[PDB]
Amino acid sequence: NIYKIDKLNNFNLNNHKTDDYSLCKDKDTALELTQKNIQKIYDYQQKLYAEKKEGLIIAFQAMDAAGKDGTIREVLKALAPQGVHEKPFKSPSSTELAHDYLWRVHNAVPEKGEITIFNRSHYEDVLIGKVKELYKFQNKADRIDENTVVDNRYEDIRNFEKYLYNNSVRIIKIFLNVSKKEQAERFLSRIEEPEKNWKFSDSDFEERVYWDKYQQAFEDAINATSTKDCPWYVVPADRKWYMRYVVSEIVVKTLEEMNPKYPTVTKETLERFEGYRTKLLEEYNYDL
Amino acid sequence: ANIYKIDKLNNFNLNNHKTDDYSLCKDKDTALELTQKNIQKIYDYQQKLYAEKKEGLIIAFQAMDAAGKDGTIREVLKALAPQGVHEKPFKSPSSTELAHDYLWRVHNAVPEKGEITIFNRSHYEDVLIGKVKELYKFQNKADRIDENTVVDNRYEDIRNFEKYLYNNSVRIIKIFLNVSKKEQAERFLSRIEEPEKNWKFSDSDFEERVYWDKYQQAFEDAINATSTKDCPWYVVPADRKWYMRYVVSEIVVKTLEEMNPKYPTVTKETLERFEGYRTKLLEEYNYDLDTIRPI
Amino acid sequence: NIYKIDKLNNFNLNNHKTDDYSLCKDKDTALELTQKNIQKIYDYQQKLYAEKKEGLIIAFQAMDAAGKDGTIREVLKALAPQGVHEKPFKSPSSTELAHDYLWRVHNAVPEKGEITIFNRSHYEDVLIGKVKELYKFQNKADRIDENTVVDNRYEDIRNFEKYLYNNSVRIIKIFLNVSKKEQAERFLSRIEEPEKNWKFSDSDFEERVYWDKYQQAFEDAINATSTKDCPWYVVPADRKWYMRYVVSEIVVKTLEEMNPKYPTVTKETLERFEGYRTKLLEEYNYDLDTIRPI
Amino acid sequence: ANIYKIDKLNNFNLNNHKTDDYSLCKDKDTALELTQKNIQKIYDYQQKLYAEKKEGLIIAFQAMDAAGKDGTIREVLKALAPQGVHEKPFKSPSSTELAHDYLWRVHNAVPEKGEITIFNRSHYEDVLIGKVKELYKFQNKADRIDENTVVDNRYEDIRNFEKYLYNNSVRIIKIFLNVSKKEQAERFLSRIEEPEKNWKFSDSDFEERVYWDKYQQAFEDAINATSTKDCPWYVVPADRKWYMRYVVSEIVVKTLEEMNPKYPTVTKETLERFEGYRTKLLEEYNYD
Ligand SMILES: Nc1ncnc2c1ncn2[C@@H]1O[C@H](COP(=O)(O)OP(=O)(O)CP(=O)(O)O)[C@@H](O)[C@H]1O
Ligand SMILES: Nc1ncnc2c1ncn2[C@@H]1O[C@H](COP(=O)(O)OP(=O)(O)CP(=O)(O)O)[C@@H](O)[C@H]1O
Ligand SMILES: Nc1ncnc2c1ncn2[C@@H]1O[C@H](COP(=O)(O)OP(=O)(O)CP(=O)(O)O)[C@@H](O)[C@H]1O
Ligand SMILES: Nc1ncnc2c1ncn2[C@@H]1O[C@H](COP(=O)(O)OP(=O)(O)CP(=O)(O)O)[C@@H](O)[C@H]1O
Ligand SMILES: [Mg+2]
Ligand SMILES: [Mg+2]
Ligand SMILES: [Mg+2]
Ligand SMILES: [Mg+2]
Ligand SMILES: [Mg+2]
Ligand SMILES: [Mg+2]
Ligand SMILES: [Mg+2]
Ligand SMILES: [Mg+2]
Ligand SMILES: [Mg+2]
Ligand SMILES: [Mg+2]
């Protein structure tokens, strides 16, 4: 489709507008379809957790004020608490930098049965990491050539994500594609609305100088890491209502692929359970 | 303070707390509606708590099997947004956990300031099944550890841990879901009979019933030993799901109300810099942005 | 007990000289005895690890260049790798500060059978934390009284260390008491010796302006947290050879009190193991080296 | 030597690697002394590695019970200072570890740059006992996971994980302590007969011997599938402890030599500030 990228070297960011709304032009229709999706997401979550077969990472990667937290909140607040974690990837700590860049990411992968939301991800290491060439200023072995760091990261990311797939963990990778002007509108709202002032930071503003280089880094990453098993989704982010609709559709269709079910217990277990049932009935004279 | 809130030591008589009390709200449909209103208020409080990053909250459920821990967590606390929430079931300790001290695994799960951690079971298991089955007698420990004071030292150390947490901006809500033995049996029958619930039944669920009375006494002992003003116990009648969900929603709302979270007010320095950012943004687009202020 | 403080409100730092050497006046004797102690520490560690009954924290708290790392290295390199962790407590990360201050410390406590060395400790929260009043700049609930933060930390620390003791974890708390001048000598060496340059920092120099306040904070902490179960050891730190001797003595004598032993198997296990012995011998037609030659 | 080092795929014949080869050093006392020389050098390199904070080292021992893992770790690596050292035994996975993917618990234990982590057993357990006992057939996983390719996918994913670590300044030394069944028996008899060693013996130690030949096959298969230039396997004869300790000391010291750690040299600006501090210190004590 128009938003799913599932092969390498097949992505042109200029062809993906930030304000496309072609799947559903009517805002109230989209709001309602979102609510239908959310109810199904809930139901699938309950089955996933009962079965304990397969985990799911829901990863959002986007510029500041593109919509990550608000999309996470509005679309996934319907989930029950059981088996859910949300992990924001912030500027790495000293300990995290002292380790390898996937250490903190792999640590947060969900168990089978569980859902982990990533607010940012391992892709920071080929986004800000690439744009600011952070590897040039970081401690590493003399034998690491700076000229292969980024290409090795794309290979290693491909390999890590495939390893996860092969071990019953799927990843949903969502790029919330916001325009520079819409970012500005949202920033002004963070400044002007006292309830939002806590969400604005110096680094939010400072990234704007590098806007075009970030766009290029996104394009490069999506070209390097989109596969059938681990696709990228490029979601127009200029309208929150439409972005929340599209994300709800991606999550529900991925859960449908996983097809979780309540487990069937073995015939032996069922016979033992029937024994316990009789004992319970006998204890209360069959008045239960 | 309340019929259900125990907030002083040595003040608890479990036989005076009926499993089927419903005195705060006798009408099921009233309670269902009020619970939904509570859940919205919990969400609103959570958003402020998360913004402020001042105080963390543990919501701990301790109860017998099929008392309603998971059901209550799901129906009431699905209100929360995902941000800043963890749910931690305490299961039979692993080798590594047993090789450590018993609070190690529990302290590791404590929330950050601004965050909420739900405990499905807790450190109290170490004075419930730990006491009932005298598990300390079969566990590795130093020769100098006096077996006769293990449990009393646990109540003291738990009091001190919870007070330490309170002194460091972490509150704990301790909820005992007080179910009857018969209602437990009814819920077990449903786990057996309903295919969608069969995964939730275990041999150990049935086998704990032999120790029912000993567990009741251990609960009473623990609540007598650890209820304080800062770290009270709530004894919630559990025989009606609708009522238990109402009461739990009320406890959570009222605790968040006491925490009184607010969206942070930024310093004068931040405000000055924000004015500069606003102007730069406006100038970049020739003042063609949505502003709530005049130009 | 000239160096051991084991009761509350019983410590006067001015009575503890940084250059006392009264337990062993002869350097070469002390060097030899330290080597003997190190071998004994290794032997005890092997028994401790086998038994899996009791854990040990060895915690060093001192100013920069007092000799924490060098003493850890020279004395505790005796240990086999199995069951050992060394945990330096640095400036807390965002995550650590978002948690409660004992979170990161409790996470690092050893398992039964194991030894964790703390280079700095939870006491930083009543040392630099008290000196610089760091609690005034940190996120916390409005109901927290800033004026009782430090006193509550001494009570909570006492309680945490007692809790550990009650759960089979001992703590050795060592204050390496160096003089301001000897610190200056050691700083000069870090500057002048190329292989040591990496160990010097601006913050090392800058702490010297707060020397007296740090001394007072150490005194306050030792007054507030010394007990029979969790004593403090105030070790003169102006001579490395003597400091290493004294530390080796404290560690040997603490392990001796723990009295670790290789475990004895149960009668049931012994019978099974005797059966396995027979099977092994029969498999090789008795051509195995047995200490019961038949 | 290239007699013990395997550094290419599909190049390994276990039957040609005898458990009692001693061809690098036939004289026990010469070997014991060379071991002590190596140990002094390992210590020196450890100090520099820790100062530099550029590269981490995993020293992984994978071997049957009583092959010599603990005793080799102890005798060869007790000379290490405690700073920057961890030892991690991989035991039977806990419920939480099984709920996660099999590399989660392994990757969590990887050392920081500057640090050394000893692995007693490793991620290779998942293609040793995991293969021998077909543990994946009894473990929760997604329905889409092909049981017939689980082990092959594990070799691929292990190759990719180890390469990823190498690309991120973490080396791994993989040591197979190749002990004979008879020598295992001799060592087990000692564990039974010496009361101080009884704690080291278990029913599972004795029970593994029924699968001896399947384990030998699994080792051969693993070493064929995972030996590379950057992440070689070392097949160390384990029937004589003195010789095994010598060879392990040689592998570790030569790997550290390759890492070539150095005490850092500070920048000219920092040096000038330090010279400022030196003067102030000298002035404070009147040049004493
Ligand atoms: N691997 C990595 N390397 C460098 N920066 C990273 C990173 N992973 C995330 N970050 C950065 O951390 C920031 C996290 O954004 P978030 O909105 O959570 O915090 P913030 O804006 O308050 C943090 P800051 O203090 O940097 O402004 C972003 O600037 C993001 O690019
Ligand atoms: N500190 C502790 N010591 C001993 N048992 C503990 C414990 N903490 C929790 N447990 C026990 O672990 C069990 C956890 O039950 P839970 O309902 O989560 O099922 P489970 O997933 O552990 C498998 P099962 O249904 O067979 O119990 C309870 O029996 C609880 O008492
Ligand atoms: N809880 C705490 N609160 C604040 N600061 C803390 C702390 N725990 C440790 N620290 C501080 O962190 C520093 C730890 O020193 P560290 O060993 O990281 O090196 P450093 O940055 O001083 C470089 P150098 O090797 O030159 O001394 C000390 O200044 C110590 O007081
Ligand atoms: N990934 C994994 N899957 C299954 N078993 C694993 C494993 N990793 C390690 N193990 C097993 O765990 C055991 C750990 O060996 P070790 O000799 O330390 O333990 P142990 O003998 O104390 C366990 P016990 O005494 O219960 O038999 C070995 O049998 C090893 O094969
Ligand atoms: Mg965000
Ligand atoms: Mg929710
Ligand atoms: Mg930012
Ligand atoms: Mg439950
Ligand atoms: Mg149970
Ligand atoms: Mg130090
Ligand atoms: Mg050592
Ligand atoms: Mg310092
Ligand atoms: Mg071993
Ligand atoms: Mg074994």
Author numbering:
A (entry chain C): 3 to 290
B (entry chain B): 2 to 296
C (entry chain A): 3 to 296
D (entry chain D): 2 to 289
Could you pull the original sentences from the published paper?
EbPPK2 is a class III polyphosphate kinase that accepts a surprisingly broad range of substrates. PPKs catalyse the transfer of phosphate groups between adenosine-5′-triphosphate (ATP), as “energy currency” of the cell, and polyphosphate (polyP), a linear polymer of up to hundreds of phosphate units, as energy storage. While PPK2-I enzymes prefer the reaction from ADP to ATP, PPK2-II enzymes favour the reaction from AMP to ADP. The PPK2-III enzymes catalyse both aforementioned phosphorylation reactions, making this subclass the ideal source for enzymes used in ATP recycling or ATP analogue generation. The enzyme forms a homotetramer with four active sites and a polybasic patch which guides the polyP through a tunnel to the active site adjacent to the Walker A motif.
